[PDB]
Amino acid sequence: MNDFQKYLSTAPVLLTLWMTFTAGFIIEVNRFFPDMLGLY
Amino acid sequence: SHTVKIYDTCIGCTQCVRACPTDVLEMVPWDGCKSGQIASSPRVEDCVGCKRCETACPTDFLSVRVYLGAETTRSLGLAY
Amino acid sequence: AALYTHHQYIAGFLMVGAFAHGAIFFVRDYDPELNKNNVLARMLEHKEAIISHLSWASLFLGFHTLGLYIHNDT
Amino acid sequence: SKNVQVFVEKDAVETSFAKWAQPGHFSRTLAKGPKTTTWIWNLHADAHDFDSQTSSLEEVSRKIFSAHFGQLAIIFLWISGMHFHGAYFSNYSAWLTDPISIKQSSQVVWPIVGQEILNADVGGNFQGIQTTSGWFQMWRAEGITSEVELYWTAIGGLAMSAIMLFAGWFHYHKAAPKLEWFQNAESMMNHHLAGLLGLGCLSWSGHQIHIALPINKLLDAGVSPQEIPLPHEFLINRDLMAQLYPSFSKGLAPFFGGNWGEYSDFLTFKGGLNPVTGGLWLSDIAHHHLALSVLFIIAGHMYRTNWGIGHNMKEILEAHKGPFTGEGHKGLYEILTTSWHAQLAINLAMMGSLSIIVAHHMYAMPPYPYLATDYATQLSLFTHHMWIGGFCVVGGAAHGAIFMVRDYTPANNYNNLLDRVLRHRDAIISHLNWVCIFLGCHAFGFYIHNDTMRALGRPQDMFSDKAIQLQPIFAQWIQNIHLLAPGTTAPNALATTSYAFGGDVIEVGGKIAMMPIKLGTADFMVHHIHAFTIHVTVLILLKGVLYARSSKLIPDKANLGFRFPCDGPGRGGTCQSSSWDHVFLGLFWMYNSISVVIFHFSWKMQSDVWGTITPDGAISHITGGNFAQSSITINGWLRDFLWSQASQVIQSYGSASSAYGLIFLGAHFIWAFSLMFLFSGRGYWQELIESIVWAHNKLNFAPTIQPRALSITQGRAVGLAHYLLGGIGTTWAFFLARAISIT
Amino acid sequence: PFPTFGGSTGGWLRAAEVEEKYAITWTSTKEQIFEMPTGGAAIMRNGENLLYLARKEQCLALSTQLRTFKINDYKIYRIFPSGEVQYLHPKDGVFPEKVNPGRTSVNSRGFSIGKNPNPASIKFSGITTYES
Amino acid sequence: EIGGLTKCSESAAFTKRLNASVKKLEQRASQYEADSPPALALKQQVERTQARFDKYSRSELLCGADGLPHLVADGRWSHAAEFILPGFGFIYISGWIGWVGRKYLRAVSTSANPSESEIIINVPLALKIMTTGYIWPISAWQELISNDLVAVSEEITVSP
Amino acid sequence: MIDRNSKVRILRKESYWFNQIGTVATVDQSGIRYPAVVRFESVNYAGTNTNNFALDELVEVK
Amino acid sequence: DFLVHHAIALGLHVTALILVKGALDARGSKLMPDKKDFGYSFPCDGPGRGGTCDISAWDAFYLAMFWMLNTIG
Numbered sequence A: 001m002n003d004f005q006k007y008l009s010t011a012p013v014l015l016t017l018w019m020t021f022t023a024g025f026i027i028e029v030n031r032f033f034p035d036m037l038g039l040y
Numbered sequence B: 001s002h003t004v005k006i007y008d009t010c011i012g013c014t015q016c017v018r019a020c021p022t023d024v025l026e027m028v029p030w031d032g033c034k035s036g037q038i039a040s041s042p043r044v045e046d047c048v049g050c051k052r053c054e055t056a057c058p059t060d061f062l063s064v065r066v067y068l069g070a071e072t073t074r075s076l077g078l079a080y
Numbered sequence C: 001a002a003l004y005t006h007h008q009y010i011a012g013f014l015m016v017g018a019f020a021h022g023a024i025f026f027v028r029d030y031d032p033e034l035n036k037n038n039v040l041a042r043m044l045e046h047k048e049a050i051i052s053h054l055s056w057a058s059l060f061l062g063f064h065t066l067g068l069y070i071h072n073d074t
Numbered sequence D: 001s002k003n004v005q006v007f008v009e010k011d012a013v014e015t016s017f018a019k020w021a022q023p024g025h026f027s028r029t030l031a032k033g034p035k036t037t038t039w040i041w042n043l044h045a046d047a048h049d050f051d052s053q054t055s056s057l058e059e060v061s062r063k064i065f066s067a068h069f070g071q072l073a074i075i076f077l078w079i080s081g082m083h084f085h086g087a088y089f090s091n092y093s094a095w096l097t098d099p100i101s102i103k104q105s106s107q108v109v110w111p112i113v114g115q116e117i118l119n120a121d122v123g124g125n126f127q128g129i130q131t132t133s134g135w136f137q138m139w140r141a142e143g144i145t146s147e148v149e150l151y152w153t154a155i156g157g158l159a160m161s162a163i164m165l166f167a168g169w170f171h172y173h174k175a176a177p178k179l180e181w182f183q184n185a186e187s188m189m190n191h192h193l194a195g196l197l198g199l200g201c202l203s204w205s206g207h208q209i210h211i212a213l214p215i216n217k218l219l220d221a222g223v224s225p226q227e228i229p230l231p232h233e234f235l236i237n238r239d240l241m242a243q244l245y246p247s248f249s250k251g252l253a254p255f256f257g258g259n260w261g262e263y264s265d266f267l268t269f270k271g272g273l274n275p276v277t278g279g280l281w282l283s284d285i286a287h288h289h290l291a292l293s294v295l296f297i298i299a300g301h302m303y304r305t306n307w308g309i310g311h312n313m314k315e316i317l318e319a320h321k322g323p324f325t326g327e328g329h330k331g332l333y334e335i336l337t338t339s340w341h342a343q344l345a346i347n348l349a350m351m352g353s354l355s356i357i358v359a360h361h362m363y364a365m366p367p368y369p370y371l372a373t374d375y376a377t378q379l380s381l382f383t384h385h386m387w388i389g390g391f392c393v394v395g396g397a398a399h400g401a402i403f404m405v406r407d408y409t410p411a412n413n414y415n416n417l418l419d420r421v422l423r424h425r426d427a428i429i430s431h432l433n434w435v436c437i438f439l440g441c442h443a444f445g446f447y448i449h450n451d452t453m454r455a456l457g458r459p460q461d462m463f464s465d466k467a468i469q470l471q472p473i474f475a476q477w478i479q480n481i482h483l484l485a486p487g488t489t490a491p492n493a494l495a496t497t498s499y500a501f502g503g504d505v506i507e508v509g510g511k512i513a514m515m516p517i518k519l520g521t522a523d524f525m526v527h528h529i530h531a532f533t534i535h536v537t538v539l540i541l542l543k544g545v546l547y548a549r550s551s552k553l554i555p556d557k558a559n560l561g562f563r564f565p566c567d568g569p570g571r572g573g574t575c576q577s578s579s580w581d582h583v584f585l586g587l588f589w590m591y592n593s594i595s596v597v598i599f600h601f602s603w604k605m606q607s608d609v610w611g612t613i614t615p616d617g618a619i620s621h622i623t624g625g626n627f628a629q630s631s632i633t634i635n636g637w638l639r640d641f642l643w644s645q646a647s648q649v650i651q652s653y654g655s656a657s658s659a660y661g662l663i664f665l666g667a668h669f670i671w672a673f674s675l676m677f678l679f680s681g682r683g684y685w686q687e688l689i690e691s692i693v694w695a696h697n698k699l700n701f702a703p704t705i706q707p708r709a710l711s712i713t714q715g716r717a718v719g720l721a722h723y724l725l726g727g728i729g730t731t732w733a734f735f736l737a738r739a740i741s742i743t
Numbered sequence E: 001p002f003p004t005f006g007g008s009t010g011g012w013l014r015a016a017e018v019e020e021k022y023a024i025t026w027t028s029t030k031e032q033i034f035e036m037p038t039g040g041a042a043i044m045r046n047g048e049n050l051l052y053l054a055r056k057e058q059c060l061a062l063s064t065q066l067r068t069f070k071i072n073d074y075k076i077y078r079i080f081p082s083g084e085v086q087y088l089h090p091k092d093g094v095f096p097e098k099v100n101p102g103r104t105s106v107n108s109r110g111f112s113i114g115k116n117p118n119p120a121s122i123k124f125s126g127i128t129t130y131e132s
Numbered sequence F: 001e002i003g004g005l006t007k008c009s010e011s012a013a014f015t016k017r018l019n020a021s022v023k024k025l026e027q028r029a030s031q032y033e034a035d036s037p038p039a040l041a042l043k044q045q046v047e048r049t050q051a052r053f054d055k056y057s058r059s060e061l062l063c064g065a066d067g068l069p070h071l072v073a074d075g076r077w078s079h080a081a082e083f084i085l086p087g088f089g090f091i092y093i094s095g096w097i098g099w100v101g102r103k104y105l106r107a108v109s110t111s112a113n114p115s116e117s118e119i120i121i122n123v124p125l126a127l128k129i130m131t132t133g134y135i136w137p138i139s140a141w142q143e144l145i146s147n148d149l150v151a152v153s154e155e156i157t158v159s160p
Numbered sequence G: 001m002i003d004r005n006s007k008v009r010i011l012r013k014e015s016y017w018f019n020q021i022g023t024v025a026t027v028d029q030s031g032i033r034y035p036a037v038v039r040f041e042s043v044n045y046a047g048t049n050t051n052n053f054a055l056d057e058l059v060e061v062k
Numbered sequence H: 001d002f003l004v005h006h007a008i009a010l011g012l013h014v015t016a017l018i019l020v021k022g023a024l025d026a027r028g029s030k031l032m033p034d035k036k037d038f039g040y041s042f043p044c045d046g047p048g049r050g051g052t053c054d055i056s057a058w059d060a061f062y063l064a065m066f067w068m069l070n071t072i073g
């Protein structure tokens, strides 16, 4: 477990997870609040 | 042909003279360093300009500097 | 149309040459001692600042200009 | 005891996640830790170079076997996904009912951000991206009929993927074979040539004879897919098969007896293409695989194993020596049984060469139902396999050079063929250089001559079919030979192997599937250009292999390695003198070569083959036959091909083909981006980085992993990578978009 | 005393006959196969061996290989067209990597690389900063 | 209006674009039928299109002759939603990221292995440091006036 | 003062570690031209972490 | 016109960066602190210290020419 957590703490892995999360939240925002070119 | 100069920062590691592909460098007696030896360039007429020597120097800045210059058959490595 | 493109291209070559000879000057004719704390020497003292900031400007302009174009394309 | 035995070590490597948390464990140097950004890049570049990670062939060998299982697992997952996507996200059922109208589609995009436009109205009450891999045609030939079957094959794929992954772990961590096991070429060839290929073909023939053939006959006749009996029904009720093929009634009795003629119903040598589907008759394909199976199984009994009879490859190789070749093929056996790189070289070159052959043979002799009329799929497959082939061929050369620098031993190679080759390398390279110049000057000169003449208003002085003409007489002759073969040199055949050589126009759905392809002056000119491109590629690559260890310029290149940046600024300059660099340059020429080939295919077909034919004999080709008088000049290619056939991509915005337009542009960008890595040097970049780092330091922060510029070699690699991606990507979109429209 | 070799197209050319030529000599205790810089494999003789090359680097490269065979008695010479010969390596009998009393320093500057003169100072002189 | 532009609510070109766009989708839907999954999708798409145009119409966006919205960024607060307000968002988020990053680097710099903690991040510490960036504006100013942000010529420089 | 384990700032303009801090390892007392041996925590463009400097090129930092 | 003008700005700035850097880093750098002793144009300084290709000032002119053409284009 400890060792696996270290692998999951490696730079490449963390970047992918973080970017996936970031991408996801951006996509989700556009799904519910779509087509915005300004704050209204 | 090319010009090779050695500076006082040499430490007599002998690495440069062991890397020259054409025996241009030698290790001569000296007292400025603990090793008691310094490098010399007695036969620069055979330098091809490889700069392998510089790549081997351990000093902060190369104690052995090769300045490329006039070119001859020997310096241009022409077997023909 | 020809005249405009002609002079603009010549202008570019002339501009690049100026900077080129400016560099030749530093390597060949610059006397560090004569120009002590001169306006010219101080330029070479904050060289990193100039280069770094010019880099940032280029990056800012590059990212956003290209980004906006691609947004419009998509 | 037995010459061939199984030796395996139990529990060789413990399974744990410790090493996973220690990046760079494989290397002694990298293991120490990161001090500069170079460490990161080196980690990824030395990951699969087992030879440098260990000094024992056994260990290297063990890793390779397991790694291969991993690739197989990935491949299985890939195939599984395709079948699943064809079961849940496709219009196969509708297409199956009306193959001519409905368009194949197996990918659907989520309705996010207007990307839905990409979901086209393919047909069959379905909206999705039109795929071009040819899955639907293959499935029809197999006799899938339902989408339930596709689901099950998908499940099988997932299961198989898992089994392979387990095998990899098992044969590396629990039961690792020893070197003696690996070094059994005769046994391996016997097994692979009789079991993998022979039994494989026989098994496939069984499926084709008992399941595919019957179902496809019913489909072609007109029976609705739902009305066709399930596959198992055919296997059980012999009477049903007898109705379709009236020989199954006799059973296997004819086979055990010598009367193989009775099976002429399903085993045939018809030749040509099925008029209804526009594909090769499955009966012929069944006989094909059956015949090949017998051949392979027999061939698998040629090498000695443990029963005395057979051949020993070493003896065969050593016996073949002559007056002009010294010791002959002595020493080769040891090389190929003690060097993985050497084996990869030969194997990789042959694999790539096969792909190129597949591309040619698969368009002239369409193998699947309803494939020829689908111009998009045809173009996609030809180009795809042409590329895969080029890369593999260049790769073979690369690994060949790695052998010379890492595994070649002068002692084991005295006066053998290899030694003698390296002893007259100057002659070989000198002559090839001339051949390349000759071909290049004459071949390309023809085009330049024509351009000048047409521009100067002197069309009568051009090398054209209407002026000075350069006809491909030899090829024209072979075509006639092949056309008249059926009934003469091939008495039992009924039609030409391909209608390309000659024959009638096969049309399916009002569209031309195949037609005689004629060869004239333009064809002569282009074919010779292909020769030039290939020859130059060989020059660069061969020079790299022959001069890998030494040269007059750098006598000790071997010690420097296979991938060194240079030897220095001396000797007038020694930049890019490694064998790696020769491969680097070779890839650029391979790109050029393949690009021209695929363009030839695209224009020739759209001009002299593809098109529509009326109920009466009126053939209208897509481009109108412009190839003859326009492909003889460079301006013609730029105007009548690139400029005209690119009207689709550039005008794709607002349509389901918009993606191709965006990718076309994106690829151009990446191609240009690469030119900055290919023209610049590490020095400028390193100095720039210094100034940037100054800023970070001025604010009291800077990375301990000191930022450094990419190595000389990496710079070149990054440049080549982006260059290739951009160029190939651009054509990819261009072709696909154009094809969708023409189809 | 030539080693056993079957010939190659990578040997010497006219320069060796009209400008200058090189030759290496060594002694072996066994007949073994070595790789020659020109390209190919050859078998050395049990005793004295002589080989001709076109470049000094080619000769010194072979010497490196010889050291692997534990041969350290190699000698390199340059033969001019008229027949004059110059002994080149080991020049003083002692390999250059080993300090030998009696060798004088050459091309040595007694200061750090950063103490060289400024280019402008030596303008219109003909000398370079590193030679100044 | 500013620059001779017209409000999109009062631009005929804008409306023409809307009608045309919807028509295209509707024409496509005609081929499919009733509750066919394809038709329902196209129908939903037209709703989104109508909504988008409506939103822009109710906005203060100014359209040009082409009937396309043009943004204003001269500093006027009348059109702050177009650039100023969104701009603050970027600055806040970007500063947050930069500040937290610098903090972590400086924090792990004094560790047993300062380079291992850059390739294998200490997630627990990182998360703590990341949360403390919401007040980056205040912290930064405080660090500047404390002479702890900008260094003082004790950094490596080029030979000249 | 330059002495074993002392920390100093390099004053050689040609050094990769100019205006940086290093720890004096040992100072030779035999009259060699560059007696002090300073060690740094950062590798140079060549990958070295040590160099020998003269006492004048080093200023004690504390 | 707004966008194209900002693109032209990018060109001028990037071309200038290359040229200005070349001028300032012509008498020396961290990679080659003794550049002034080699001149305005030299091939390189060897495959060592990481690789020193295109490190001379002349190379800045070489690299800037491409950008100049792009911007003028």
Ligand code: CLA
Pocket: D433, D436, D437, D438, D439, D440, D441, D442, D444, D445, D448, D536, D539, D540, D585, D588, D589
């Ligand atoms: C359009 C660009 C272009 C052109 C024309 C060439 C041309 C050539 N390359 Mg090349 N190359 C290029 C781009 C190009 N390269 C790029 C981008 C790369 C980077 C990967 C390379 C990398 C590369 C390598 C690595 C190699 C070549 C080689 C060759 C030569 C092949 C021999 C040959 O056909 O001679 C004929 C050359 C022609 C240009 C034919 C046209 C000339 C006319 C039509 C023929 C008659 C003219 C007559 C001789 C004189 C007329 C007189 C009057 C005009 C003054 C040839 C000189 C190979 C080589 O040198 O081996 C021989 C080789 O090994 N190239």
Ligand code: CLA
Pocket: C013, C014, C016, C017, C018, C020, C024, H040, H041, H058, H061
């Ligand atoms: C008044 C203008 C002017 C003057 C007097 C000089 C003078 C000088 N420059 Mg300079 N320069 C200028 C403008 C000028 N330059 C401009 C505008 C640029 C920007 C491009 C440069 C860029 C530049 C560089 C980068 C360098 C110089 C150098 C030099 C010095 C040597 C020149 C040399 O060796 O050329 C000798 C003669 C030639 C090079 C012949 C030129 C042949 C050209 C390149 C090819 C011709 C084009 C082609 C053939 C057209 C055919 C096409 C056809 C097929 C259609 C000399 C002091 C060099 C130096 O070291 O000085 C210290 C140097 O390195 N200059």
Ligand code: CLA
Pocket: C055, C056, C058, C059, C060, C061, C062, C063, C064, C066, C067, D669, D670, D672, D673, D674, D675, D676, D679, D680, D688, H014, H017, H018, H062, H063, H064, H066, H067
């Ligand atoms: C298409 C070709 C191409 C492109 C795109 C670039 C791009 C660049 N070059 Mg360049 N160059 C090229 C060809 C090209 N070059 C060629 C052929 C040469 C030979 C002369 C050079 C020679 C050269 C020199 C000598 C220098 C540059 C520099 C630069 C940079 C300038 C700063 C900039 O624009 O930042 C913006 C960069 C980009 C927009 C390009 C990358 C874009 C990617 C896709 C990121 C996009 C992000 C996007 C906006 C969204 C981000 C958020 C997302 C993560 C969610 C930039 C990376 C300069 C430099 O180092 O910069 C300071 C510099 O000194 N180049």
Ligand code: CLA
Pocket: A013, A016, A017, A020, D077, D078, D079, D080, D081, D082, D084, D085, D089, D107, D108, D109, D110
């Ligand atoms: C060659 C393999 C392959 C490829 C390229 C695709 C591609 C696609 N599939 Mg598909 N599929 C495949 C195999 C494949 N499939 C197989 C074998 C099955 C059977 C299980 C399926 C079952 C399937 C379904 C059921 C669906 C798809 C869908 C899709 C599409 C959306 C993909 C998606 O989820 O995006 C979004 C991606 C995600 C949601 C995944 C999240 C991203 C993760 C978290 C990043 C990875 C984390 C990283 C690895 C961490 C590393 C940790 C370390 C231990 C390694 C996309 C075109 C969807 C679709 O088309 O809908 C219309 C859909 O519904 N596929």
Ligand code: CLA
Pocket: D064, D065, D068, D069, D072, D181, D182, D184, D187, D188, D191, D192, D194, D195, D196
């Ligand atoms: C008749 C026996 C037999 C068969 C079928 C194979 C088949 C194969 N060997 Mg192989 N091998 C054999 C004997 C055999 N070997 C022997 C005796 C030796 C020792 C001398 C080796 C040593 C050896 C090495 C060293 C390597 C192989 C590799 C391979 C694979 C090559 C890749 C390929 O074509 O993918 C085709 C892929 C498939 C067809 C997928 C199915 C694969 C499974 C394992 C087939 C097993 C039979 C299957 C269950 C059908 C049963 C019939 C039943 C339904 C009625 C292939 C699966 C290479 C490899 O990649 O291995 C991982 C490799 O590196 N073999």
Ligand code: CLA
Pocket: D044, D045, D046, D047, D048, D049, D050, D348, D391, D392, D393, D394, D395, D396, D398, D402, D563, D580, D583, D721, D725
């Ligand atoms: C059967 C196929 C095969 C196999 C098993 C190998 C195996 C090997 N090759 Mg080899 N090679 C092959 C095919 C193959 N090659 C082909 C076809 C070529 C020609 C291009 C080469 C060219 C080649 C060179 C030039 C070199 C090797 C080297 C190596 C060795 C180390 C590989 C390495 O560094 O891993 C690490 C692997 C990688 C870093 C690859 C990662 C993938 C990169 C990033 C490209 C990804 C492109 C991607 C598809 C694009 C996606 C676009 C998207 C992002 C939009 C290893 C023995 C190297 C060596 O030292 O040998 C001893 C070496 O120098 N090979």
Ligand SMILES: CC1=C(/C=C/C(C)=C/C=C/C(C)=C/C=C/C=C(C)/C=C/C=C(C)/C=C/C2=C(C)CCCC2(C)C)C(C)(C)CCC1
Pocket: C018, C019, C021, C022, C023, C025, H023
């Ligand atoms: C009247 C008027 C106006 C104007 C204003 C102004 C005042 C402007 C300015 C402008 C300017 C003000 C510009 C400038 C420019 C500059 C430049 C363009 C520069 C360049 C430089 C260089 C190129 C350098 C060089 C060099 C080097 C590199 C180093 C040293 C040496 C030398 C010097 C050689 C306005 C708008 C219209 C409007 C109102 C009125």
Ligand code: SF4
Pocket: B004, B019, B020, B021, B022, B023, B024, B025, B046, B047, B048, B049, B050, B051, B052, B053, B054, B066
């Ligand atoms: S440059 Fe090459 S030949 Fe000259 S001294 Fe250095 S190593 Fe010897």
Ligand code: SF4
Pocket: B006, B009, B010, B011, B012, B013, B014, B015, B016, B017, B038, B039, B056, B057, B058, B059, B062, B063, B064
């Ligand atoms: S490598 Fe450098 S320090 Fe060592 S002996 Fe040669 S010149 Fe002196």
Ligand code: SF4
Pocket: D565, D566, D567, D568, D569, D574, D575, D576, D712, H043, H044, H045, H046, H047, H048, H051, H052, H053, H054
């Ligand atoms: S740095 Fe570049 S130019 Fe200099 S020797 Fe190495 S490869 Fe040649």
